[PDB]
Design a protein around this nucleic acid. Structure first.
Ligand SMILES: CO/C(CO[C@H]1O[C@H](C)[C@@H](OC)[C@H](OC)[C@@H]1O)=C1\O[C@H](Oc2ccc(/C=C(\C)C(=O)N[C@H]3[C@@H](O)[C@H](n4cnc5c(N(C)C)ncnc54)O[C@@H]3CO)cc2)[C@@H](O)[C@@H]1O
Ligand SMILES: *C(=O)[C@H](CCSC)NC=O
Ligand SMILES: [K+]
Ligand SMILES: [Mg+2]
Ligand SMILES: [Mg+2]
Ligand SMILES: [Mg+2]
Ligand SMILES: [Mg+2]
Ligand SMILES: [Mg+2]
Ligand SMILES: [Mg+2]
Ligand SMILES: [Mg+2]
Ligand SMILES: [Mg+2]
Ligand SMILES: [Mg+2]
Ligand SMILES: [Mg+2]
Ligand SMILES: [Mg+2]
Ligand SMILES: [Mg+2]
Ligand SMILES: [Mg+2]
Ligand SMILES: [Mg+2]
Ligand SMILES: [Mg+2]
Ligand SMILES: [Mg+2]
Ligand SMILES: [Mg+2]
Ligand SMILES: [Mg+2]
Ligand SMILES: [Mg+2]
Ligand SMILES: [Mg+2]
Ligand SMILES: [Mg+2]
Ligand SMILES: [Mg+2]
Ligand SMILES: [Mg+2]
Ligand SMILES: [Mg+2]
Ligand SMILES: [Mg+2]
Ligand SMILES: [Mg+2]
Ligand SMILES: [Mg+2]
Ligand SMILES: [Mg+2]
Ligand SMILES: [Mg+2]
Ligand SMILES: [Mg+2]
Ligand SMILES: [Mg+2]
Ligand SMILES: [Mg+2]
Ligand SMILES: [Mg+2]
Ligand SMILES: [Mg+2]
Ligand SMILES: [Mg+2]
Ligand SMILES: [Mg+2]
Ligand SMILES: [Mg+2]
Ligand SMILES: [Mg+2]
Ligand SMILES: [Mg+2]
Ligand SMILES: [Mg+2]
Ligand SMILES: [Mg+2]
Ligand SMILES: [Mg+2]
Ligand SMILES: [Mg+2]
Ligand SMILES: [Mg+2]
Ligand SMILES: [Mg+2]
Ligand SMILES: [Mg+2]
Ligand SMILES: [Mg+2]
Ligand SMILES: [Mg+2]
Ligand SMILES: [Mg+2]
Ligand SMILES: [Mg+2]
Ligand SMILES: [Mg+2]
Ligand SMILES: [Mg+2]
Ligand SMILES: [Mg+2]
Ligand SMILES: [Mg+2]
Ligand SMILES: [Mg+2]
Ligand SMILES: [Mg+2]
Ligand SMILES: [Mg+2]
Ligand SMILES: [Mg+2]
Ligand SMILES: [Mg+2]
Ligand SMILES: [Mg+2]
Ligand SMILES: [Mg+2]
Ligand SMILES: [Mg+2]
Ligand SMILES: [Mg+2]
Ligand SMILES: [Mg+2]
Ligand SMILES: [Mg+2]
Ligand SMILES: [Mg+2]
Ligand SMILES: [Mg+2]
Ligand SMILES: [Mg+2]
Ligand SMILES: [Mg+2]
Ligand SMILES: [Mg+2]
Ligand SMILES: [Mg+2]
Ligand SMILES: [Mg+2]
Ligand SMILES: [Mg+2]
Ligand SMILES: [Mg+2]
Ligand SMILES: [Mg+2]
Ligand SMILES: [Mg+2]
Ligand SMILES: [Mg+2]
Ligand SMILES: [Mg+2]
Ligand SMILES: [Mg+2]
Ligand SMILES: [Mg+2]
Ligand SMILES: [Mg+2]
Ligand SMILES: [Mg+2]
Ligand SMILES: [Mg+2]
Ligand SMILES: [Mg+2]
Ligand SMILES: [Mg+2]
Ligand SMILES: [Mg+2]
Ligand SMILES: [Mg+2]
Ligand SMILES: [Mg+2]
Ligand SMILES: [Mg+2]
Ligand SMILES: [Mg+2]
Ligand SMILES: [Mg+2]
Ligand SMILES: [Mg+2]
Ligand SMILES: [Mg+2]
Ligand SMILES: [Mg+2]
Ligand SMILES: [Mg+2]
Ligand SMILES: [Mg+2]
Ligand SMILES: [Mg+2]
Ligand SMILES: [Mg+2]
Ligand SMILES: [Mg+2]
Ligand SMILES: [Mg+2]
Ligand SMILES: [Mg+2]
Ligand SMILES: [Mg+2]
Ligand SMILES: [Mg+2]
Ligand SMILES: [Mg+2]
Ligand SMILES: [Mg+2]
Ligand SMILES: [Mg+2]
Ligand SMILES: [Mg+2]
Ligand SMILES: [Mg+2]
Ligand SMILES: [Mg+2]
Ligand SMILES: [Mg+2]
Ligand SMILES: [Mg+2]
Ligand SMILES: [Mg+2]
Ligand SMILES: [Mg+2]
Ligand SMILES: [Mg+2]
Ligand SMILES: [Mg+2]
Ligand SMILES: [Mg+2]
Ligand SMILES: [Mg+2]
Ligand SMILES: [Mg+2]
Ligand SMILES: [Mg+2]
Ligand SMILES: [Mg+2]
Ligand SMILES: [Mg+2]
Ligand SMILES: [Mg+2]
Ligand SMILES: [Mg+2]
Ligand SMILES: [Mg+2]
Ligand SMILES: [Mg+2]
Ligand SMILES: [Mg+2]
Ligand SMILES: [Mg+2]
Ligand SMILES: [Mg+2]
Ligand SMILES: [Mg+2]
Ligand SMILES: [Mg+2]
Ligand SMILES: [Mg+2]
Ligand SMILES: [Mg+2]
Ligand SMILES: [Mg+2]
Ligand SMILES: [Mg+2]
Ligand SMILES: [Mg+2]
Ligand SMILES: [Mg+2]
Ligand SMILES: [Mg+2]
Ligand SMILES: [Mg+2]
Ligand SMILES: [Mg+2]
Ligand SMILES: [Mg+2]
Ligand SMILES: [Mg+2]
Ligand SMILES: [Mg+2]
Ligand SMILES: [Mg+2]
Ligand SMILES: [Mg+2]
Ligand SMILES: [Mg+2]
Ligand SMILES: [Mg+2]
Ligand SMILES: [Mg+2]
Ligand SMILES: [Mg+2]
Ligand SMILES: [Mg+2]
Ligand SMILES: [Mg+2]
Ligand SMILES: [Mg+2]
Ligand SMILES: [Mg+2]
Ligand SMILES: [Mg+2]
Ligand SMILES: [Mg+2]
Ligand SMILES: [Mg+2]
Ligand SMILES: [Mg+2]
Ligand SMILES: [Mg+2]
Ligand SMILES: [Mg+2]
Ligand SMILES: [Mg+2]
Ligand SMILES: [Mg+2]
Ligand SMILES: [Mg+2]
Ligand SMILES: [Mg+2]
Ligand SMILES: [Mg+2]
Ligand SMILES: [Mg+2]
Ligand SMILES: [Mg+2]
Ligand SMILES: [Mg+2]
Ligand SMILES: [Mg+2]
Ligand SMILES: [Mg+2]
Ligand SMILES: [Mg+2]
Ligand SMILES: [Mg+2]
Ligand SMILES: [Mg+2]
Ligand SMILES: [Mg+2]
Ligand SMILES: [Mg+2]
Ligand SMILES: [Mg+2]
Ligand SMILES: [Mg+2]
Ligand SMILES: [Mg+2]
Ligand SMILES: [Mg+2]
Ligand SMILES: [Mg+2]
Ligand SMILES: [Mg+2]
Ligand SMILES: [Mg+2]
Ligand SMILES: [Mg+2]
Ligand SMILES: [Mg+2]
Ligand SMILES: [Mg+2]
Ligand SMILES: [Mg+2]
Ligand SMILES: [Mg+2]
Ligand SMILES: [Mg+2]
Ligand SMILES: [Mg+2]
Ligand SMILES: [Mg+2]
Ligand SMILES: [Mg+2]
Ligand SMILES: [Mg+2]
Ligand SMILES: [Mg+2]
Ligand SMILES: [Mg+2]
Ligand SMILES: [Mg+2]
Ligand SMILES: [Mg+2]
Ligand SMILES: [Mg+2]
Ligand SMILES: [Mg+2]
Ligand SMILES: [Mg+2]
Ligand SMILES: [Mg+2]
Ligand SMILES: [Mg+2]
Ligand SMILES: [Mg+2]
Ligand SMILES: [Mg+2]
Ligand SMILES: [Mg+2]
Ligand SMILES: [Mg+2]
Ligand SMILES: [Mg+2]
Ligand SMILES: [Mg+2]
Ligand SMILES: [Mg+2]
Ligand SMILES: [Mg+2]
Ligand SMILES: [Mg+2]
Ligand SMILES: [Mg+2]
Ligand SMILES: [Mg+2]
Ligand SMILES: [Mg+2]
Lengths: 48, 275
RNA sequence: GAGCUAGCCCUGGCCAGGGUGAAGCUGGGGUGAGACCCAGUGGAGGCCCGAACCGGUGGGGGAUGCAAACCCCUCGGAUGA
RNA sequence: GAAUGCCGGCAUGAGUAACGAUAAAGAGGGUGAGAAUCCCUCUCGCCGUAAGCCCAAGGGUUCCUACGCAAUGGUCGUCAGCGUAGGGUUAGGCGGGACCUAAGGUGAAGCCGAAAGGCGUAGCCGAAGGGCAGCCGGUUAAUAUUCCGGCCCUUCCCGCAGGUGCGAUGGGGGGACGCUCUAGGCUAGGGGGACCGGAGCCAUGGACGAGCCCGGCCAGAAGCGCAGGGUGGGAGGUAGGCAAAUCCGCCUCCCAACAAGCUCUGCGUGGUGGGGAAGCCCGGGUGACAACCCCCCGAAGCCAGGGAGCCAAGAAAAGCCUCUAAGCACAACCUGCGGGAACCCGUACCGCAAACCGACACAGGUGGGCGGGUGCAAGAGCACUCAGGCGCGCGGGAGAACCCUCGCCAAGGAACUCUGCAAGUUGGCCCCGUAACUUCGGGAGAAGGGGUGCUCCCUGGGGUGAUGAGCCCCGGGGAGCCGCAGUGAACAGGCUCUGGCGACUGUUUACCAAAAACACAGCUCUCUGCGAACUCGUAAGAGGAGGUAUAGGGAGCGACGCUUGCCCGGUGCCGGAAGGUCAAGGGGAGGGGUGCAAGCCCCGAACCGAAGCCCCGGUGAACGGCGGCCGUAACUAUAACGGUCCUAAGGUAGCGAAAUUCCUUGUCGGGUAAGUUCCGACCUGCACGAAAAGCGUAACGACCGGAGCGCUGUCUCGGCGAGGGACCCGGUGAAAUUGAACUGGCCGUGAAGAUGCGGCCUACCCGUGGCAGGACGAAAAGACCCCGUGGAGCUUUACUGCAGCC
RNA sequence: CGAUGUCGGCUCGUCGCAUCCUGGGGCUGAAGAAGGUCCCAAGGGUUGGGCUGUUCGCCCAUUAAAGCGGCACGCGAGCUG
RNA sequence: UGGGAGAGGGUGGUGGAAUUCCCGGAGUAGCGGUGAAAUGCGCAGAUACCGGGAGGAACGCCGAUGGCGAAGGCAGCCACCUGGUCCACCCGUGACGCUGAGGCGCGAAAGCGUGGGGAGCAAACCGGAUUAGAUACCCGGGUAGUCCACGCCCUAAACG
RNA sequence: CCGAGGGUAGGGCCCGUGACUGGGGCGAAGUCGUAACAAGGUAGCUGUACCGGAAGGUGCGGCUGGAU
RNA sequence: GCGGGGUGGAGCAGCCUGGUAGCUCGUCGGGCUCAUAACCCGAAGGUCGUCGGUUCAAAUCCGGCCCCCGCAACCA
């Protein structure tokens, strides 16, 4: 049947993207945390 | 003079449509239309604040002149009468001798190719607009300003009208469409005649789908819900109201007056409404 | 977190073929004038049959599955909420 | 040593299930250490509105070539979407950006919020919408509207010529719009040709033929032709389009008004450039100087911004054209010609799937376009088949039970069973015919029946063309032929009677309920005078609504028909400037503390004092409620009648053993041989009843009852047959479960149901196909039940708070 | 209660005997026939339908007869629901 | 041809008296109602009186034993539109007449549908009296309806 | 070919009959009330509407076949 | 199981709070009327379901018994 993950590069970037995260207090603390933990990528990969 | 249909479908058996006989022009005046932004009953928060709205036919807003004291003494000819999907009334196209074109809601009995005019010294004829103070007591009137220069607020729906009952200082007494007896300032403009399309209320929608065309989504009864949803929710099987009949938000809906008591306009409302 | 799902908004797209034959219009008849009757034309409809498409009624199968809801037969809607 | 402990390792089940659609294979020849599985050939089968082809998402080198086979591939592997390496994606015209706006997002000005932040006009961003200039063919192992060939076109810069009041983010026009139906003329595509071109073929009884087989085009500037779209011309006045305006709007006058003219697209033709089959040789060559023509069918695509009808009344902005303002009129813009200039990103490949979403090379899911031919009335249905693509990554045997999917069955024909569940029957088209009832539409495909192929003769009308031949499309009549059978295959209703519920088409518990539930038009009550009520928000601000009582909110009821009784004592809502109570506050009789005292400080009666409550009324389609006992008629029985008590008032019409009736399978009637169900009645209604509506109602229903006809493997009652499994052999090889086990029966005993204790009996050791009585078999720390001063949802005249409102 | 699935049907039986029939008896208010009652006897047999979920029961048509019980109210790793 | 009386019909308009409700003023202990009462109303200020406003229905005197119409029926006043009818003159047509099964139209009240309207009155209904009872007659309330528009119904002691 | 008639299916008319149900007629001495005839103790009758154990009552309009 | 009830002939007060039985109707007697009903004037009638008990004293308060109404009978 139709499953839940239905990829969309524009959707991904506008939802979870760097610029999305920076526009918000909670979003910015996500980046802060992920940097502090030392994540190799702070934001989902998407091909633009 | 509403139109009927033969019972060749179940729904078509009860349906009635307007006779559209007054309409003489079937596309709007392009410089006088702008897009009507459909809300679906959602506010700027994106929240439903008026339940059961949406999905109706696309519409173009016809810009309506609810002022008229704009062009005092400048006569106009009634160029056409058209359909307006945003209101019950019909609208009349006015070609001012000024070269200006403008919409008003069409009063009853108004004919294309007649002259209309606005101002203190305008004749008492259907289609004209005057300050209330200059209109003869006893005259039926529509598109009435409530306060001066603020715009026509009163009696704009199809077939509605207000009647001048008397005068008192700078104010005149109106009998509103509701039956309320109210004081309205004498400087308030108002158009003589009743709003047209009085047979509007005799229309029988005929089927569920016709509600949907009008942007009216299905209304679900509180009794059909659960207690999380509504005061009348739940109950094993059908249930009587079992408490004073209420709205989704808890307040009583059978008689409970809701007009704010300390409202300043109380000093101007003489008698509360009719039936 | 509304890339599943529910609603609404904006902009596009889709619905083989066949059947029924509303109003209207024209002519004919009728009448003081009418209503109305007949025929032709006309092509209405949450109209009818039926693919695509949207479903999921009954039964069978599957049940460490092909599948954490599927498969077969059958069945509902298919110009419309 | 135990925690259904944690991590890891390794066992058991077991050579067991399985190896992922039953579209299907066989052989010959290659290659190689090794071949059912790789390559080639022939034969066979499968898809062909797809299982072919193109595009968009998503994916991200998977593309092509060489070299490999440890792992990946459900087997094998020499092969591969796998490993290594090298190569491959080329644009002014295709798509997106250097253009435009949509929702929405953002957001100078402005507003609001303890902070973080929330709003918000203009503007800006935002696309599969608008706008915008490239078509045919060739070429590579792999790219091509990109490279190349031919033939075209756009913008920008500059220059030349000619023209003009040039000039804009400003004004105006335009862009610019729905749904259904649809005309004319074309194109796409297709059928045929006795015509044109072609390697060849004559078989096996016949055919050297007006034979068979193959093909018979594509693109193309200007001009021309056919078909369409768009668009009146001139003058005078002007106060409106937020400056101006010769523009646009308005008024008047004249001319032209189904036209023409001008303009703009489609199609045709068109210099020219391309393509070009079978077959036969080895993707290439030839065929070939290939031919490239005529007739028919014909779109849903084109002309297009076409037409008509209808109500539910159908984006914006730019490009473009026109107007003027500053300014400038040595300019500048317009037109033609010429040269120069023309950037960034994508382009491989998969793309209904083995490369996307489903952990898998997963019978699932995934938007758009093209989708040939014949026949069946049509069609994208169905059967076959073209181009093209496949035989689904374990096989070989066997021919048991049993399972699935399928075929047939004597006699009977629902006797099966909760139930005709299931499966039969029926089945398309044409014609005949068709009942109650009805809201006059319907019910209707009612029911029921007849016809259906092929041949010969005669004949009517239409499209095209020419008015004719040919082609193609609808028909009518006669005479015949064959079969068991003519919609000969495939696709394609079983029907009738009668209740209950719901009017109706719709909607729902994604994944156990599709219904009588929700919705629904319609009906009523009620709130709301507009800065509306109401809703979201602390707020600003929004929705309501750019609406205005024929409108908007809330509630119940639920098409329609005939109707909807009585009770206002209690709760609610509505009204009531009296009275009663009432908080802070006002008041200050009278006290108190302290000081030597002026004073400072504390308490404080009457009385004035709001909403609320009390109090007086109203109100039922507001919450709701609508009696008991006893007696009475000239047979009896029963009580129209009466007596009395109680209530706020004592249930009306209609209906009634009901989706409601306990006793109950009430009683009686109908149907049956027989009827706890069903239908019709009766009425002592345990416990109907009037908008939580009452009683009906044509039509409707994958709803739930009951009956009948038709037909059947449902059954009596089973039999045979087919394929996929099951079985045997080669290959690969799980699982839950498992204290260990050397694990019988009976009668007892035992914590009360013993392989395991007693006594007896029976029993050689080990497997394979099978069946399920037991191992209180497995799975899941029982959902029921209780317990816990355990939890959560829900309710209220439980308690206590808070929003909100007064 | 870290699960002993449950009415009825179906299928498959097997056992008990307080015996429904068939076999053998005594007594009879047993003339014969046909009954009643009691004894012995478990070898075999013990029908098909209408109603209802039913077990049971009522009914229809037959029969030699249309028996009653146990087996986790036998039997869902056998099916139904 | 000329002339006449009339509530004949239809449409639009409009005038006064009265009832009721509402606002204001003044004023106080009752009003109302009947056979007699009670219910009801009233110190929360009623009844009675004055000013103002809204609204609906009906038209006093003229009015008659009258007029008009086919009947049902028609009554303030005004305008428009329109039917029937009588008289006079003796001008025109030249039997063109009478009746009329069917058909068609009209048709009081009540009643029905859809909107409106609603003062007074008032089925139903409630209450107070009477009575053995009183589902009545009398009293206080009171919903349809009475009124308008359009569409139905088509009855009558539609009688002379 | 026609054809008596047989068969299948579906309509129309008529008769008989049916649990039960509706009123009707009749029946020496039943129960309740007293509507009409006198102004019948509310003049009656009336068409229609609603209501009531029952006659009836009431509304709206009509008739005199109404007493005064 | 829980609650309520039994009193002149009928239907109801009295019980709670011990001493006292009452209201309407009916029945009997007289009146009015030609007569009956209505109406009017008088009057009779219970000894409180039954058996115990508390008490000076019981319809009354407590207990047992018999009836009579209403409510309840739920989870599997
Ligand atoms: C019942 O639950 C279970 C088993 O559950 C397991 O299996 C289930 C199938 C699973 O369900 C998904 C479950 O998963 C959780 C679990 O694995 C268990 O409880 C078992 O213990 C039992 C307890 C009670 C019962 C029977 C009960 C509660 C009962 O009420 N029986 C009634 C009813 O069946 C039957 N009955 C009375 N009325 C009528 C009647 N009427 C009213 C007309 N008409 C007809 N049948 C009537 O009568 C019986 C006795 O009176 C049976 C077993 C235990 O051994 C077993 O593990
Ligand atoms: C009672 O029978 C119960 C039924 C479950 S109801 C959720 N099961 C008992 O074992
Ligand atoms: K339970
Ligand atoms: Mg996932
Ligand atoms: Mg998606
Ligand atoms: Mg994207
Ligand atoms: Mg997106
Ligand atoms: Mg972002
Ligand atoms: Mg890194
Ligand atoms: Mg990581
Ligand atoms: Mg209609
Ligand atoms: Mg109109
Ligand atoms: Mg615009
Ligand atoms: Mg916003
Ligand atoms: Mg937001
Ligand atoms: Mg709302
Ligand atoms: Mg909404
Ligand atoms: Mg309109
Ligand atoms: Mg005002
Ligand atoms: Mg209308
Ligand atoms: Mg609409
Ligand atoms: Mg609803
Ligand atoms: Mg609701
Ligand atoms: Mg509910
Ligand atoms: Mg619910
Ligand atoms: Mg919620
Ligand atoms: Mg709640
Ligand atoms: Mg409730
Ligand atoms: Mg409920
Ligand atoms: Mg209930
Ligand atoms: Mg419910
Ligand atoms: Mg209720
Ligand atoms: Mg309740
Ligand atoms: Mg509120
Ligand atoms: Mg008001
Ligand atoms: Mg979020
Ligand atoms: Mg979504
Ligand atoms: Mg999405
Ligand atoms: Mg399609
Ligand atoms: Mg036709
Ligand atoms: Mg037409
Ligand atoms: Mg349809
Ligand atoms: Mg299914
Ligand atoms: Mg089936
Ligand atoms: Mg499953
Ligand atoms: Mg399937
Ligand atoms: Mg299927
Ligand atoms: Mg199928
Ligand atoms: Mg269909
Ligand atoms: Mg739609
Ligand atoms: Mg230990
Ligand atoms: Mg474990
Ligand atoms: Mg543990
Ligand atoms: Mg572990
Ligand atoms: Mg192992
Ligand atoms: Mg092993
Ligand atoms: Mg095994
Ligand atoms: Mg496979
Ligand atoms: Mg498998
Ligand atoms: Mg191999
Ligand atoms: Mg090999
Ligand atoms: Mg193979
Ligand atoms: Mg090969
Ligand atoms: Mg095909
Ligand atoms: Mg991937
Ligand atoms: Mg390998
Ligand atoms: Mg290998
Ligand atoms: Mg290697
Ligand atoms: Mg592998
Ligand atoms: Mg695999
Ligand atoms: Mg090799
Ligand atoms: Mg190029
Ligand atoms: Mg640039
Ligand atoms: Mg922009
Ligand atoms: Mg774009
Ligand atoms: Mg558009
Ligand atoms: Mg482009
Ligand atoms: Mg120029
Ligand atoms: Mg210019
Ligand atoms: Mg410009
Ligand atoms: Mg527009
Ligand atoms: Mg339409
Ligand atoms: Mg055409
Ligand atoms: Mg072409
Ligand atoms: Mg063809
Ligand atoms: Mg021969
Ligand atoms: Mg100007
Ligand atoms: Mg070639
Ligand atoms: Mg050559
Ligand atoms: Mg058009
Ligand atoms: Mg200047
Ligand atoms: Mg650049
Ligand atoms: Mg490419
Ligand atoms: Mg592809
Ligand atoms: Mg698929
Ligand atoms: Mg596709
Ligand atoms: Mg693939
Ligand atoms: Mg995936
Ligand atoms: Mg595979
Ligand atoms: Mg797949
Ligand atoms: Mg067909
Ligand atoms: Mg295969
Ligand atoms: Mg396949
Ligand atoms: Mg057979
Ligand atoms: Mg038969
Ligand atoms: Mg049966
Ligand atoms: Mg059945
Ligand atoms: Mg079936
Ligand atoms: Mg069949
Ligand atoms: Mg068929
Ligand atoms: Mg009919
Ligand atoms: Mg029909
Ligand atoms: Mg048929
Ligand atoms: Mg043949
Ligand atoms: Mg087939
Ligand atoms: Mg069919
Ligand atoms: Mg029933
Ligand atoms: Mg339903
Ligand atoms: Mg339904
Ligand atoms: Mg119903
Ligand atoms: Mg309905
Ligand atoms: Mg409905
Ligand atoms: Mg479900
Ligand atoms: Mg569920
Ligand atoms: Mg789910
Ligand atoms: Mg299901
Ligand atoms: Mg359904
Ligand atoms: Mg309704
Ligand atoms: Mg809020
Ligand atoms: Mg707005
Ligand atoms: Mg509303
Ligand atoms: Mg209510
Ligand atoms: Mg509903
Ligand atoms: Mg309902
Ligand atoms: Mg009817
Ligand atoms: Mg009440
Ligand atoms: Mg009250
Ligand atoms: Mg009350
Ligand atoms: Mg006072
Ligand atoms: Mg104080
Ligand atoms: Mg109550
Ligand atoms: Mg009362
Ligand atoms: Mg009643
Ligand atoms: Mg009634
Ligand atoms: Mg009954
Ligand atoms: Mg029954
Ligand atoms: Mg019963
Ligand atoms: Mg029962
Ligand atoms: Mg029975
Ligand atoms: Mg019978
Ligand atoms: Mg049943
Ligand atoms: Mg029945
Ligand atoms: Mg009875
Ligand atoms: Mg209710
Ligand atoms: Mg009903
Ligand atoms: Mg029906
Ligand atoms: Mg259904
Ligand atoms: Mg079988
Ligand atoms: Mg086989
Ligand atoms: Mg092996
Ligand atoms: Mg051992
Ligand atoms: Mg052993
Ligand atoms: Mg024991
Ligand atoms: Mg034992
Ligand atoms: Mg021992
Ligand atoms: Mg032992
Ligand atoms: Mg032993
Ligand atoms: Mg033994
Ligand atoms: Mg073996
Ligand atoms: Mg085995
Ligand atoms: Mg076993
Ligand atoms: Mg076992
Ligand atoms: Mg489990
Ligand atoms: Mg646990
Ligand atoms: Mg537990
Ligand atoms: Mg559990
Ligand atoms: Mg506690
Ligand atoms: Mg405790
Ligand atoms: Mg707790
Ligand atoms: Mg809690
Ligand atoms: Mg247990
Ligand atoms: Mg377990
Ligand atoms: Mg004898
Ligand atoms: Mg035996
Ligand atoms: Mg036996
Ligand atoms: Mg039985
Ligand atoms: Mg029984
Ligand atoms: Mg037992
Ligand atoms: Mg089972
Ligand atoms: Mg069972
Ligand atoms: Mg088991
Ligand atoms: Mg077991
Ligand atoms: Mg069940
Ligand atoms: Mg003469
Ligand atoms: Mg003469
Ligand atoms: Mg006559
Ligand atoms: Mg009439
Ligand atoms: Mg009234
Ligand atoms: Mg008279
Ligand atoms: Mg015969
Ligand atoms: Mg008698
Ligand atoms: Mg009388
Ligand atoms: Mg009398
Ligand atoms: Mg009388
Ligand atoms: Mg009575
Ligand atoms: Mg009465
Ligand atoms: Mg005498
Ligand atoms: Mg005594
Ligand atoms: Mg005593
Ligand atoms: Mg004593
Ligand atoms: Mg005593
Ligand atoms: Mg006593
Ligand atoms: Mg006492
Ligand atoms: Mg419970």
């Amino acid at each position: 049947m139709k499953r839940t993950w239905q990829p969309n590069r524009r959707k991904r970037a506008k939802t979870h993207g760097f610029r999305a995260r920076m526009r918000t207090p909670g979003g910015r603390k996500v980046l802060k945390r992920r940097r502090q933990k030392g994540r190799w990528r702070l934001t989902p990969a998407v091909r633009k | 003079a509403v139109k009927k249909f033969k019972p060749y479908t179940p729904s078509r058996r009860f349906m009635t449509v307007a006779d559209f006989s007054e309409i003489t022009k079937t596309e709007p005046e392009k410089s006088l239309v702008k897009p009507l932004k459909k809300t679906g009953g959602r506010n700027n928060q994106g929240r439903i604040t008026v339940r059961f709205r949406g999905g109706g036919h696309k519409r173009l807003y016809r810009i309506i002149d609810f002022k008229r004291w704009d062009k005092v003494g400048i006569p106009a000819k009634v160029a056409a009468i058209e359909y307006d999907p945003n209101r019950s009334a019909r609208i009349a196209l006015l070609h001012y001798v000024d070269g200006e074109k403008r919409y008003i809601i069409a009063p009853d009995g108004l004919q294309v190719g007649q002259q209309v005019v606005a101002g203190p010294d305008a004749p008492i004829q259907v289609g004209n607009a005057l300050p209330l103070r200059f209109i003869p007591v006893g005259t039926v009137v529509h598109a009435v300003e409530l306060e001066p220069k603020k715009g026509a607020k009163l009696a704009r729906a199809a077939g509605t009208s207000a009647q001048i009952q008397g005068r008192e200082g700078d104010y005149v007494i109106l009998r509103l469409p509701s039956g309320e007896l109210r004081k309205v300032h004498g400087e308030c403009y108002a158009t003589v005649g009743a709003v047209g399309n009085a047979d509007h209320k005799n229309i029988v929608l005929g089927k569920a789908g016709r509600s949907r065309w009008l942007g009216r989504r299905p209304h679900v009864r509180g009794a059909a819900m659960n207690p999380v949803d509504h005061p009348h929710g739940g109950g094993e099987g059908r249930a009587p109201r079992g408490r004073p009949p209420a709205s989704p938000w808890g307040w009583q809906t059978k008689g409970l007056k809701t007009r704010k008591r300390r409202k300043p306009s109380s000093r101007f409302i003489i008698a509360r409404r009719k039936k």
